[PDB]
Amino acid sequence: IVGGYTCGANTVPYQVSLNSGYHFCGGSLINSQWVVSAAHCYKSGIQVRLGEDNINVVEGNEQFISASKSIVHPSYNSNTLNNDIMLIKLKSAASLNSRVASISLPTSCASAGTQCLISGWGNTKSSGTSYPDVLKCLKAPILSDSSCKSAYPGQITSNMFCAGYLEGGKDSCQGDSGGPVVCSGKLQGIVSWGSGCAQKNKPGVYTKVCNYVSWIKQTIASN
Ligand SMILES: [Ca+2]
Numbered sequence: 001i002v003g004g005y006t007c008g009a010n011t012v013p014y015q016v017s018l019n020s021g022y023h024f025c026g027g028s029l030i031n032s033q034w035v036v037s038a039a040h041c042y043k044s045g046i047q048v049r050l051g052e053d054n055i056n057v058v059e060g061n062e063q064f065i066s067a068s069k070s071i072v073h074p075s076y077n078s079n080t081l082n083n084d085i086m087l088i089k090l091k092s093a094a095s096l097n098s099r100v101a102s103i104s105l106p107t108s109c110a111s112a113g114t115q116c117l118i119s120g121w122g123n124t125k126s127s128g129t130s131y132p133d134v135l136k137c138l139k140a141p142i143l144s145d146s147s148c149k150s151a152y153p154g155q156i157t158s159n160m161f162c163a164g165y166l167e168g169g170k171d172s173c174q175g176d177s178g179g180p181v182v183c184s185g186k187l188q189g190i191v192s193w194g195s196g197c198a199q200k201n202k203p204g205v206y207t208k209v210c211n212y213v214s215w216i217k218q219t220i221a222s223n
Contacts, residue, residue: 001118001119001120001122001124001132001136001137001138001171001172001173001176002123002124002125002126002169002170002171002172002173002197002198003138003169003170003171003198004118004124004136004137004138004170005136005137005138006132006134006135006136006137007053007119007134007135007136007137008053009053009054009059009061009134009135010051010053010061010098010099010100011135011137012117012119012135012137012180013029013051013098013099013100013101014028014029014030014101014102014103014180014182014187015027015028015029015052015119015120015135015179015180016028016029016035016048016049016050016052017048017049017052017055017121018035018037018041018046018047018048018049018088018178019046019047019048019049019055019064020043020045020046020047023049023055023121023175024041024043024175025037025038025041025175025177025178025179026119026120026121026122026175026176026177026178026179026180026191027041027048027088027178027179027180028103028179028180028182028187028190029050029094029100029101029102029103030102030103030105030187030216031102031220032090032093032094032096032102033089033090033092033093033094034087034088034089034090034220035048035067035087035088035089035090036085036086036087036088036187036190036209036216037085037086037087037088037178037179037190038084038085038086038177038178038190038191038192038207039072039073039076039078039083039084039085039086040078040081040084040177040178040192040193041086041177041178042070042072042086046066046067046070046088047064047065047066047067048064048065048066048067048088048090049062049063049064050062050063050064050065050094050100051063051099051100052135053134053135054133054134055121055133055134056133057133061099061100063094063095063100065090065091065092065094066090066091067088067089067090067091068089068090068091069088069089069223070086070087070088070089071086071087071088071089071219071223072086073085073086073212073215080155080157081160081192081193081205082157082159082160083159083207084159084160084190084192084193084207085190085207085209085212087216087219087220087223089223103180103182103185103186103187104185104186104187105186105187105209105213105216105217106186106187106188106209106210106213107186107213108210109188109208109210109211110142110183110184110186110188110210111142112141112142112143112144112145113141113142114141114142114183114184114188115139115140115141115183116139116140116141116142116163116181116182116183116188116189117137117138117139117180117181117182117183118137118138118139118140118163118172118176118179118180118181118189118191118204119135119136119137119138119176119179119180120135120136120172120175120176120177120179120191121133121134121135121136121175121176122136122172122173122174122175122176122177122179122191123173123174123175123176123197124136124173125173125197126168126169126171126173126196126197126198126199131175138164138170138171138172140163140164140165140170140181140204141163141164142161142162142163142183142188143161143162143163143164143166143203145161147162147166148160148161148162148203148205151166151201151202151203152195152202152205155205156205158208158211159207159208159211160192160205160206160207160208161189161205161206161208162203162204162205162206163181163189163203163204163206164203164204165203166200166201166203167200168198168199168200168201168202169198170198171194171197171198171199171203171204172191172194172197172204173194173197173198174197176191177191177192178190178191179191181206187209188206188208188209188210189206189207189208189209190206190207190209191204191206192204192205192206192207193205
């Protein structure tokens with residue numbers, strides 16, 4: 001997260017870190033045994049880390065649970081990043097509490113102008129590289145489809161939306177991938193892609209979660 005703020009320990013209780021020896025992606029806990037992340041975060045040997053603030057220090061509220069299976073969306077295209085969504089099942093159910101909690105799926109799609117919270121442990125520089133140990137947060141509005149398409153001609157599908165600031169300086173970034181965009185207590189987006197980070201006229205692009213609710217529910221119900 002570039003141009004954000006320190007969230008505060010366990011203030012984003014649905015935020016998870018995906019770990020394969022090191023943090024490589026974010027995710028969102030949507031019930032006691034399932035996480036939603038980006039399909040481009042797919043790999044084998046995933047451990048889900050819940051209750052994290054400083055990802056380099058054991059602070060006492062963590063739960064570390066290995067993934068038993070991952071399910072990438074059947075229509076994911078890694079070239080265009082269309083359908084950039086995946087489900088991860090935990091080997092055992094997380095113990096839910098005030099600091100480890102699920103986030104509700106949308107019942108309807110959020111509109112342009114809606115304020116959302118974007119969070120993660122990604123790069124905090126738009127030019128350099130600096131990775132924070134503690135969770136970073138950014139409040140950002142969803143942008144109009146027209147402005148999103150104008151920023152990225154030929155690249156925005158019906159399964160994507162832009163959020164952030166056309167002026168630049170405030171954005172998600174490398175390492176935030178797969179993490180949450182939550183608006184009015186609903187998971188509306190997943191950190192997917194963008195050109196650099198926090199660049200003028202290149203806002204963050206996010207997977208449009210409301211398009212996938214039926215798939216998520218049906219997949220969870222049979223797996
Ligand atoms: Ca920790």
